Amino acid sequence: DSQTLVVKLGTSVLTGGSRRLNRAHIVELVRQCAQLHAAGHRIVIVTSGAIAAGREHLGYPELPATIASKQLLAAVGQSRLIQLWEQLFSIYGIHVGQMLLTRADMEDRERFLNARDTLRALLDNNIVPVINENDAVATAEIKVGDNDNLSALAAILAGADKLLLLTDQKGLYTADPRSNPQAELIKDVYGIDDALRAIAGGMSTKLQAADVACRAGIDTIIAAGSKPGVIGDVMEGISVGTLFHAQATPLENRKRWIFGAPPAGEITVDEGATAAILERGSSLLPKGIKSVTGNFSRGEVIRICNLEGRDIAHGVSRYNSDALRRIAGHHSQEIDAILGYEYGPVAVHRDDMITR
Amino acid sequence: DSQTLVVKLGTSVLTGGSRRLNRAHIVELVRQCAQLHAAGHRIVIVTSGAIAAGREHLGYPELPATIASKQLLAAVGQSRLIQLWEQLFSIYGIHVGQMLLTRADMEDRERFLNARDTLRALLDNNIVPVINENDAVATAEIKVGDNDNLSALAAILAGADKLLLLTDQKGLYTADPRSNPQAELIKDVYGIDDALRAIAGGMSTKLQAADVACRAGIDTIIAAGSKPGVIGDVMEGISVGTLFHAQATPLENRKRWIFGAPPAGEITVDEGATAAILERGSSLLPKGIKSVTGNFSRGEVIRICNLEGRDIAHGVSRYNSDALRRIAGHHSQEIDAILGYEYGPVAVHRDDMITR
Amino acid sequence: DSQTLVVKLGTSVLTGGSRRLNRAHIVELVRQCAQLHAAGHRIVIVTSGAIAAGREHLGYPELPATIASKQLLAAVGQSRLIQLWEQLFSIYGIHVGQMLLTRADMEDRERFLNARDTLRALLDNNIVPVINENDAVATAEIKVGDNDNLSALAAILAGADKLLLLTDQKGLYTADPRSNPQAELIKDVYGIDDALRAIAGGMSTKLQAADVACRAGIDTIIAAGSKPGVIGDVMEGISVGTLFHAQATPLENRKRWIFGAPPAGEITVDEGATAAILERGSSLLPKGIKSVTGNFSRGEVIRICNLEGRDIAHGVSRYNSDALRRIAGHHSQEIDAILGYEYGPVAVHRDDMITR
Amino acid sequence: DSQTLVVKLGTSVLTGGSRRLNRAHIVELVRQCAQLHAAGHRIVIVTSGAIAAGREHLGYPELPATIASKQLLAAVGQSRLIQLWEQLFSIYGIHVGQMLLTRADMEDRERFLNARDTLRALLDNNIVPVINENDAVATAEIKVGDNDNLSALAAILAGADKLLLLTDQKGLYTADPRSNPQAELIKDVYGIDDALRAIAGGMSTKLQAADVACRAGIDTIIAAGSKPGVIGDVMEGISVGTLFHAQATPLENRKRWIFGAPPAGEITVDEGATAAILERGSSLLPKGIKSVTGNFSRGEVIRICNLEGRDIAHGVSRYNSDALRRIAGHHSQEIDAILGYEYGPVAVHRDDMITR
C-alpha cells in the first residue's frame, strides 16, 4: 500500500535557531525518509533556509539589513542547499531533483499541468523532489510566509495522502502550556473553526495551510521536528501531534477542480471511445477524436460529447486546440512527427475527467 | 380558475350505431361545452365520423367496400362534418376552427411547434378548435384506431388539464357486467398495469391513450356519452366513470421533453438576459443574443450559456440558426423587417426552457 | 399569469411642476401601460390634475384664490382630463372608462359592491378604468390629500396584486440625500414603523396609503415617475424603488372583511347546495335557497346554515332579503323575469363566502 | 492500478499446427505483453513447445517414436525456447527469467515458499518470468497435460488477478458451431457445473484449470490466440471470450491455505508486537519473538500467541524453528550475521498471517 507523503521543514527546524544549518537533525530526518522510500512509498520534501546556506557559503559577510541582501543570500543558498540535500541523500543511494515553484504558477492552468507532469515523472523514476519558492521573483510578504501555503499547494499538486508540518512546538494546545499545567495537546481536529483560530496565536499560517489541505481531502499533521522517529510514526498512523482530518474526499476535490470553471471548448468523440469512456471508464485517445470546436490552451477544461451531441464527460485537455485539431484521428505514435513534440499518448487522461 | 379540457368523440357516440349522424346527442354535448366555454374554460374537441357525413352528403351511394371508397367518403365528410359542427356551435355564438393533424406531424420538431402555435392562437381568440386526422395521407392501421392516440397527442399539444374519452360503456369494470352481477365500475386508477390490460379486452386503444396521457401528467377520464351532464360533472370534478390519475407532473413532462434529445446548438447571452433568466425566470429576447453557434431549425433544443461559458439553461429555439444569427442584437420590432416574417417577440419562451 | 396593477399619478408627475399638463410624459406612461395591457395584464389608473385641465380649457382666466374657484376649475377639468386620457389611449386601441368615487362610497356596503361590480365588468371587457375623486361634493382636506388614500381604496376594491405610487423623489431615503452623501435608498420595507414615519416628513400620506394597502395584503411600490420603463420593471419584479411587502394575505383580508360585523340575517340552504359549498367550495345558487330569515340589503354579510340549522358558512348577499325570498328555489334564468333585473346568476359568490 | 496477469500458450498456438515454432504470432503476443509491461502491469508467461525447438535445433533427426525421444528433444528445446523468448523480449528492452516447476514442488510447503519468493523477486525487478514444466523428471501423463494445471498452479503462486488461456477455439460454445448455426459463445460463466463439463468434450483440461483458478479467487478467460490485441483487451476488460468469474475471494483462499492443516508449532509474542499485529495489522519481527515452542521448518503454518498465551493470530513461518530460536529478540540487521543467510527482515509477513 504505497502512499505519498509531503514533509515540510521550516527554517527553525533546519537551523535549530542558530545562524547556520544543523546537519545532524537533517541527516536523521533523511534517514527516516530513506527508510520510508525503501519501504516502497513516495516522499516529497518542501524545504527552506536558503538564506542560511547563502550566509554560510559567502563566509558570513556583513550585508545591510535589506530585502536585496535577502534576495542575494537566497540566490546563492538555493544552490548551496540543493547541494547539501543531494550530499545527504546520496548516503542512502537516493537521487534528488530540484523544483522551484510559486503560487502564481499553481494558479495558472497550464503551468500547473506542467509542474504536475514533472513531479509525477520525478516520483515515478524513484527520485525525491525537493521543492522551494522561487526567490528571484518572490515578494517580501511571500518571504515571511515560510512556504507554509506552498506546502499545501505542493501537497495538492502531488496528490499526496498525508501532509506533515514539522514545527518547534509539539503541536496545538488547548491553552498555554507554560501558564496552565492542565493545558494539553489537542490530538484530533475534525473542522477548523473560529475557536481554534482564536486558540492558535506563526501558527496562524500553519492553520491556514492545514485548512487548505483538508479542504482538498488531504490529512494534515502538525508535530515536533525534534521528536525521534516522527516520520515513521506519522506514516504508520500512530499519534504524535495535532491531526487534522480531511473534510472532503479526493473525488470531491476533483469534481470541484473540473467544475470550478466553465468549459473553454468542445470535442466530438466517436462510438468506440464513447463506449470506452462510459463502460470501461478509460482515457481518451487522439484516434477517437472526430472534431474539436473552440480555442483553448493546454490544461483548460473542455466538454466531451458523442456524435449525436449528448454531453458525456468534462475533462482537462492535454493539448491546445490547434494541436488537437492537427492530431485528431491519428495514431498515438505519430504525434511527435506531426507536432514536433508530444505530451503523452492520451488526449484526456482518465483521472482528469468526470463522466455523466 | 380556467382549465383546458379535451373531449374525444368516437363515431359510435356521434352516430349512435346508425348509418348517419345523430344530431340530438351532438347538440346536447355542444350545449354542455358552450356552458363550459361561457364559464371561462378552454375546450378542444377531437372528432370522427367523416365517413358518415360523406355517405349522407353523397346520397348514400353504393360504393364498393374498399379503402378507396373510405378515403372518398372521408374527403367529402371532412367538409360536411366541419360545416355541421360550425352550424351547431353558432347557436351559442361560438366560432369553430378546423385543424387536421397526423402523428408524423407530432413527431416532427418544427411541425409540432407550428401546430402548438396555431392551437394557442385559436384558444386565445375564444375559438373552439376541432381536431381530426388528415385522411388524405392516412393509412388503414390508424383508421381502425379511431383517433384514440391522436386524442392523447392533442391533449399533450394543448397543455390540457383533463382528457375526456366518451364511449359506449360506462367505463371500466372489474369483471364482465353481463355475466357477473357483482362486477362493478372501477372508479380510480393510479397506475396502469398488466392486470388492468388483461381485464379489458376496442378498450385497449383507449387504455393505451390513457397511459400516454397520464405519463405526460394529464388526468384521463372514461365515461359514457349518453350520461346526462357528463362534461359538466367532469369539469367540476364529480365522479362519473373510470378516472386515471396523472403519474407525473407537467414540470416533469417539460423536463423530459427538453432533455429527451441532445442540444443541436448553442447561443451566447449577455449579462442582463442572464440575470433575467436566472433571477426572474424570464424569457429570452433577440437583443440579449451575442453569438449563435451550430446549425439547427425551428423547434430544436439549444444550449444557452453566458459570456464566461457556464451553462445557465436549456431551451427550445423559436427561430432557425440563420434567422437567429441575422436578428441577434436587434430590437423585437425589427424582426419582420429583417427577415420578412416573425414568430413572436421572444427567441426562447420561458415555458420552453429549464434553468440550471 | 395575469396580474392587476393600480397606478397612481400625482399632479406633480402629470404637469411636471408647470401650470399645464405635459403630454409627453403621459404618452410615455400610456405606452408602457398599453404594452402591459397587450401582454394580458389588467391596469387601473388613479389620476389627478383636473385643475390644470380646467385652467387650460378656460384660457387661463383670472379667478380669485378660493376653493370655489378650484371646484369651478375641476368641474371642467374632469371632462377635459378624461378626454385627454381617452385620446392618448386610443392610439394603442384601448378604450377608457371614467369612475368617480369618494371614501364615503367605499364605507357603504352596497355602494362598495356596486363599484366593485362596475370595475370588474370594465376590466373583464378590456377597458381601462380611470378613477378620480368626485370633487363636486369633496372638501378642501380631501383636495390636499391628492388621491393618496383613494388610490389604496381603489387597490383594495379592484383586488390588485401591486400598487404603484409615482412621485418626484426616487423613493424612501435613510437620510437626506442632499446633506448626507452616504444616504441611500431603502429598497425593501417589511413593516411600517415609527422610525420610518419619523424619517419621511407629502410623503406622510404616501406612507399611510402604503400601510393601508399592505395591511390588505397588496404590495406597494414607491418609485420616480421620470424613471424610464418603471411600470414594466415593476410588473416584472425589478427593484426600482422602495418596496412595501404585504403584511397580511388576501385570505386574511377576506376573513377580516367578512367577520368585521355580525351577520345581519340568516338563510336556510338545502343539502345539495351545502355539499357543493363544503366539498367543492362552489357558490350559492338561488335554487338551493330554502328560507330567508331577517331583513337585509344587498352586500350585507349574512349567515348561511343548512337544513339542520348548523352554521356552514358566512358570506355576502348579492341581493336584498326581499328579492332572495321572492326568487328562492327558482332557476337562475328566471331571476330577471321575477324581479325585472338581475345582479347575477348566483346568490352568494364563492370568493365572498367563508366556509366554517 | 497495477495488475498481475498469467498467460498460458499451448503448443498449438505457438506452432500453428506445424512442426516448427511460428515466430510472427509469438512476436505479436510479445509486443502486446511488452505494451502491458510498459503500462506498469506485471506479466507471467507459461509456455510449452520445447519439443518443436529441440527438433528444429537438431536438424530434424529421425528419432524413434518413444517417450525417450520426446525427453531427448525437450532437453535441448528448453534452452532453445528460453533463448528464443529472451531474443524476442530484448527487442522491447525486457529481460526474461527461466522458471522450471512441477506439481510436486507446489505440494511441498517449503518449495512453494521458495518458488513464490523467487517469482516475487523476478517480478519486482521488472523481469518477466517464463514458467515451464520440468520434463527431465516428468511423466507421459504430465506431458499430455500441456501445462494446463501448471498454469493454474502458477497463477495461484503469483497471486495473479487474471488467468488467460489461449487456444485455437474462440471460446466455449453452447452447441457445435459447425452443425448448429444457432450455436453462440458463452460469454460469462459463474459456476462450473456438470452441464458445462458435458457440453465441452483437450478442452476438459482447460475447464479443470479454470475451475481450480476460480476456486482460488482468480478470474479465468479462454480466448483465441489469433485474435488481434487479445491481451490488451483482456487487461482492459473487454469481453473477448468465455469468462469464468471467481467464486471465492482472495481472503477466503488465504484462510483456506492457512487453516488447511493444524499448526506445527507455537511461538510467544511480546506485547508491542501483539499491539502492532492487532491494531495495525503489521508483520512479525524477530525482535518481538519471546519464545519458540516445538519444531518446524520454513513455510509451515505456526501458532502465534501473546505473553498471556491467548491465541492472537495464525501465520506462516519464514524460517525454521532453530533459526527463529537463535535469532529471537535480535534486530533484523543482525540476522545475516547470526545465521549466515537471510530470508527477509520479518519472521511472519502480514499477508501470510490471519489475525483472530
Short mmCIF file of N, CA, C and O in Angstrom, two decimals, chain C residues 238-280:
data_model
loop_
_atom_site.label_atom_id
_atom_site.label_comp_id
_atom_site.label_asym_id
_atom_site.label_seq_id
_atom_site.Cartn_x
_atom_site.Cartn_y
_atom_site.Cartn_z
N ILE C 238 -38.34 43.82 -11.03
CA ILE C 238 -37.09 44.52 -10.77
C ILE C 238 -37.30 45.57 -9.68
O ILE C 238 -38.38 46.15 -9.54
N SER C 239 -36.25 45.81 -8.90
CA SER C 239 -36.30 46.80 -7.84
C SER C 239 -36.02 48.18 -8.43
O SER C 239 -34.90 48.47 -8.85
N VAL C 240 -37.05 49.02 -8.48
CA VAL C 240 -36.91 50.38 -8.97
C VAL C 240 -37.10 51.42 -7.87
O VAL C 240 -36.82 52.61 -8.11
N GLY C 241 -37.56 51.03 -6.69
CA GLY C 241 -37.75 51.98 -5.62
C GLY C 241 -38.06 51.25 -4.33
O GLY C 241 -37.89 50.03 -4.22
N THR C 242 -38.51 52.02 -3.34
CA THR C 242 -38.88 51.44 -2.06
C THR C 242 -40.06 50.49 -2.24
O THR C 242 -41.08 50.85 -2.83
N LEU C 243 -39.92 49.27 -1.72
CA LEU C 243 -40.94 48.25 -1.82
C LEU C 243 -41.50 47.95 -0.44
O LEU C 243 -40.73 47.72 0.50
N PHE C 244 -42.82 47.96 -0.32
CA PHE C 244 -43.50 47.67 0.93
C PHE C 244 -44.20 46.32 0.80
O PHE C 244 -45.27 46.23 0.20
N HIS C 245 -43.58 45.28 1.37
CA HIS C 245 -44.14 43.94 1.27
C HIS C 245 -45.46 43.85 2.03
O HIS C 245 -45.69 44.55 3.03
N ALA C 246 -46.34 42.98 1.55
CA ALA C 246 -47.65 42.80 2.15
C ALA C 246 -47.51 42.12 3.50
O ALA C 246 -46.89 41.06 3.61
N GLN C 247 -48.08 42.74 4.54
CA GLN C 247 -48.01 42.16 5.87
C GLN C 247 -48.96 40.98 6.04
O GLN C 247 -48.63 40.02 6.74
N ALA C 248 -50.13 41.04 5.41
CA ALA C 248 -51.14 40.00 5.53
C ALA C 248 -51.33 39.30 4.20
O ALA C 248 -50.68 39.62 3.20
N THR C 249 -52.23 38.32 4.20
CA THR C 249 -52.56 37.57 3.00
C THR C 249 -53.98 37.92 2.54
O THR C 249 -54.79 38.39 3.33
N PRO C 250 -54.28 37.71 1.26
CA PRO C 250 -55.65 38.00 0.78
C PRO C 250 -56.72 37.24 1.54
O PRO C 250 -57.82 37.76 1.74
N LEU C 251 -56.43 36.00 1.95
CA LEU C 251 -57.39 35.26 2.76
C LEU C 251 -57.63 35.93 4.10
O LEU C 251 -58.77 35.99 4.58
N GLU C 252 -56.57 36.44 4.72
CA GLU C 252 -56.73 37.18 5.97
C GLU C 252 -57.59 38.42 5.77
O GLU C 252 -58.45 38.73 6.60
N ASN C 253 -57.36 39.15 4.67
CA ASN C 253 -58.16 40.34 4.40
C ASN C 253 -59.62 39.97 4.17
O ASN C 253 -60.53 40.67 4.64
N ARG C 254 -59.87 38.88 3.45
CA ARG C 254 -61.25 38.44 3.23
C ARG C 254 -61.92 38.05 4.54
O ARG C 254 -63.09 38.38 4.77
N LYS C 255 -61.20 37.35 5.41
CA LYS C 255 -61.75 36.98 6.71
C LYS C 255 -62.06 38.22 7.54
O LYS C 255 -63.10 38.31 8.20
N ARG C 256 -61.15 39.20 7.51
CA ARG C 256 -61.37 40.45 8.23
C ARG C 256 -62.61 41.17 7.71
O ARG C 256 -63.41 41.71 8.48
N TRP C 257 -62.77 41.20 6.38
CA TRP C 257 -63.93 41.86 5.78
C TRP C 257 -65.22 41.15 6.16
O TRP C 257 -66.22 41.80 6.51
N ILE C 258 -65.22 39.82 6.10
CA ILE C 258 -66.44 39.06 6.37
C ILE C 258 -66.83 39.15 7.84
O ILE C 258 -68.00 39.40 8.17
N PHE C 259 -65.88 38.95 8.74
CA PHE C 259 -66.15 38.90 10.17
C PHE C 259 -66.00 40.25 10.85
O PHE C 259 -65.95 40.31 12.08
N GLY C 260 -65.92 41.34 10.08
CA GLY C 260 -65.84 42.65 10.68
C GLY C 260 -67.08 43.02 11.48
O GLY C 260 -66.99 43.68 12.51
N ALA C 261 -68.24 42.58 11.01
CA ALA C 261 -69.52 42.87 11.64
C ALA C 261 -70.31 41.59 11.79
O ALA C 261 -70.14 40.64 11.02
N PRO C 262 -71.19 41.52 12.79
CA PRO C 262 -72.04 40.34 12.93
C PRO C 262 -73.01 40.24 11.77
O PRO C 262 -73.39 41.26 11.17
N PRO C 263 -73.42 39.02 11.41
CA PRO C 263 -74.35 38.86 10.29
C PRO C 263 -75.66 39.59 10.54
O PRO C 263 -76.18 39.62 11.67
N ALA C 264 -76.20 40.20 9.49
CA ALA C 264 -77.47 40.91 9.56
C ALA C 264 -78.66 40.03 9.22
O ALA C 264 -79.79 40.52 9.22
N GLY C 265 -78.43 38.75 8.93
CA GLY C 265 -79.52 37.85 8.61
C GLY C 265 -79.00 36.44 8.47
O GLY C 265 -77.80 36.18 8.60
N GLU C 266 -79.93 35.53 8.20
CA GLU C 266 -79.59 34.12 8.03
C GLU C 266 -80.55 33.49 7.03
O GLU C 266 -81.72 33.88 6.95
N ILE C 267 -80.05 32.52 6.27
CA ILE C 267 -80.84 31.83 5.27
C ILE C 267 -80.68 30.33 5.47
O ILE C 267 -79.71 29.86 6.06
N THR C 268 -81.65 29.57 4.96
CA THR C 268 -81.65 28.12 5.04
C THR C 268 -81.24 27.55 3.69
O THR C 268 -81.78 27.95 2.65
N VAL C 269 -80.30 26.61 3.71
CA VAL C 269 -79.69 26.09 2.49
C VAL C 269 -79.91 24.58 2.43
O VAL C 269 -79.71 23.87 3.42
N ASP C 270 -80.32 24.11 1.26
CA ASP C 270 -80.61 22.70 1.04
C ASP C 270 -79.34 21.86 1.18
O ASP C 270 -78.22 22.38 1.27
N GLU C 271 -79.51 20.54 1.18
CA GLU C 271 -78.37 19.65 1.41
C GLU C 271 -77.45 19.58 0.20
O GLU C 271 -76.23 19.45 0.35
N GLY C 272 -78.01 19.67 -1.01
CA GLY C 272 -77.17 19.66 -2.20
C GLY C 272 -76.29 20.89 -2.30
O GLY C 272 -75.10 20.79 -2.60
N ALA C 273 -76.87 22.06 -2.04
CA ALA C 273 -76.08 23.29 -2.02
C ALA C 273 -75.04 23.25 -0.91
O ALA C 273 -73.92 23.75 -1.07
N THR C 274 -75.40 22.67 0.24
CA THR C 274 -74.43 22.52 1.32
C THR C 274 -73.26 21.63 0.90
O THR C 274 -72.10 21.95 1.18
N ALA C 275 -73.56 20.52 0.22
CA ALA C 275 -72.50 19.64 -0.26
C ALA C 275 -71.61 20.35 -1.27
O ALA C 275 -70.38 20.21 -1.23
N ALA C 276 -72.21 21.12 -2.17
CA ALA C 276 -71.42 21.88 -3.14
C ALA C 276 -70.54 22.91 -2.44
O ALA C 276 -69.38 23.11 -2.82
N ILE C 277 -71.08 23.59 -1.43
CA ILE C 277 -70.33 24.63 -0.73
C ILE C 277 -69.17 24.03 0.04
O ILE C 277 -68.05 24.57 0.04
N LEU C 278 -69.39 22.91 0.72
CA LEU C 278 -68.36 22.34 1.59
C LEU C 278 -67.33 21.53 0.80
O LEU C 278 -66.13 21.81 0.87
N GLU C 279 -67.79 20.52 0.05
CA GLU C 279 -66.85 19.65 -0.65
C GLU C 279 -66.14 20.37 -1.78
O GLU C 279 -64.91 20.30 -1.90
N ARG C 280 -66.88 21.07 -2.63
CA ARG C 280 -66.31 21.68 -3.82
C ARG C 280 -66.04 23.18 -3.68
O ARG C 280 -65.38 23.75 -4.55
#
